[PDB]
Amino acid sequence: KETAAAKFERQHMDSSTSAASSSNYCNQMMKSRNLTKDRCKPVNTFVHESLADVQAVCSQKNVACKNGQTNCYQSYSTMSITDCRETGSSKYPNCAYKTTQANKHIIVACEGNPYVPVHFDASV
């Protein structure tokens, strides 16, 4: 089984690019990160910063999670991100995604030792 930390990396990390590359970025990324294998993941955010920068967020602003948990942290700075969301014209196995690039603060849930991101809560 994939560790929570490894799953967060695979689902939300994209350091190789500075910002969403084209309107087809999400269709390409969702498929290659294996998020459309048995079903189209409806929503997924990729962060375009170094893994180190994202992991560092676990030591930044402690805030509540949407679920009420208190192990969430908001990045002090905005980060380049891309939100990928299924378009009404999407249907497995033919997943289709809208690509929305933005620069915002990310909020992640952290856990373990090392204390690293295990869930992407939201972006501001």
CATH number at residue 120: 3.10.130.10
- Mind telling me the catalytic residues? 12, 119
Method underlying the structure: X-ray
Domain of 29, in residue numbers: 1-124
The residues with which 102 forms a beta bridge, in sequence order, are 81
Closest alpha carbon to 58 in 117, 105, 118: 117
CA distance 6 to 105: 22
Q: How many domains does the chain have?
A: 1
CA distance 105 to 60: 11
Resolution expressed in Å: 1.4
Residues in CB range of 59: below 8 A, 6 or more apart: 73, 115
CA distance 108 to 114: 15
Q: Which residue numbers belong to the known binding site for substrate?
A: 7, 10, 41-45, 66, 85
